[PDB]
């Protein structure tokens, strides 16, 4: 669902399974807790952006069926989510280093300007610097290095 850029459908899909598990009468309470905990924990591991993480966190902590679980399970889930967090943050910062490596992988002048115009590289770096994904000192140096290398 989220591959198409629609988070609401993903939330609806998660709720559909949670509510389908909740109302079944052929399983015991401990199995209901086990399945719900496993699915909720697994859901965080598949988020591909920091906005989806926040949306899912907001949805989960407001669901009534999650408020009545034992304390030792709520604490475990809360501790587990915070680990996939800061990791989905580190990846978004390493992405810029990967992009810079790809840019630097070219060795001839004509194709460099044909593929990576300077006015777009500068904008891409400065937009990330603005959003506090990179510190100013590691963005200005990156711009300067490319500016010197091209000359």
């Amino acid at each position: 669902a989220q591959q198409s850029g629609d988070t609401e459908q993903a939330l609806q899909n998660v709720n559909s399974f949670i509510s389908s598990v909740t109302h079944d009468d052929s399983i015991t309470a401990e199995n209901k807790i086990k399945y719900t905990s496993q699915f909720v924990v697994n859901a965080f591991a598949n988020a591909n952006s920091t906005g989806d993480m926040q949306a899912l966190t907001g949805y989960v902590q407001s669901l009534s069926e999650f408020k009545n679980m034992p304390t030792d399970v709520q604490t475990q889930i809360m501790g587990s989510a915070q680990q996939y967090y800061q990791q989905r943050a580190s990846d978004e910062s390493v992405q810029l280093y990967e992009y810079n490596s790809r840019v630097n992988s070219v060795t001839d002048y004509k194709t460099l300007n044909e593929a990576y115009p300077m006015a777009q590289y500068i904008g891409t770096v400065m937009q990330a610097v603005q959003q506090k994904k990179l510190s100013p000192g590691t963005g200005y140096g990156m711009v300067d290095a490319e500016s010197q290398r091209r000359l």
Binding site: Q86, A89, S90, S93, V94, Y97, Q131, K132, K133, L134, S135, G137, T138
Partner: protein
């Protein structure tokens, strides 16, 4: 600090930083170092058995080195200065910071 400005900072970006609620402090030892005062100033004389020029009878230099310094800082000399220049392009010398001695 002054030695961590070279870190990339790709873990815990600036978006996710906060001040800690307690003050840290490193674990260094309380030691200084101080220059000694009673050590002698040892130097060896290697000009006694050779012809040499004494100035103001310390710093030790050579004749072809001293002469150039005189011409450069010699704006108050009769235009002698050309002779000094010609000689400078042609021993041991001792003064009892070279640019200020002259």
């Amino acid at each position: 600090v002054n030695a961590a400005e070279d870190a990339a900072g790709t873990v815990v970006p600036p978006k996710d930083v906060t001040v800690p609620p307690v003050r840290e402090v490193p674990e260094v030892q309380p030691i200084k170092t101080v220059a000694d005062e009673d050590y002698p100033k040892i130097d060896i004389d290697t000009y006694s058995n050779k012809e040499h020029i004494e100035v103001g009878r310390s710093l030790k230099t050579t004749v072809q080195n001293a002469v150039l310094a005189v011409t450069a800082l010699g704006d108050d000399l009769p235009e002698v200065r050309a002779l000094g220049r010609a000689l400078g392009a042609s021993r041991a010398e001792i003064f009892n910071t070279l640019s200020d001695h002259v």
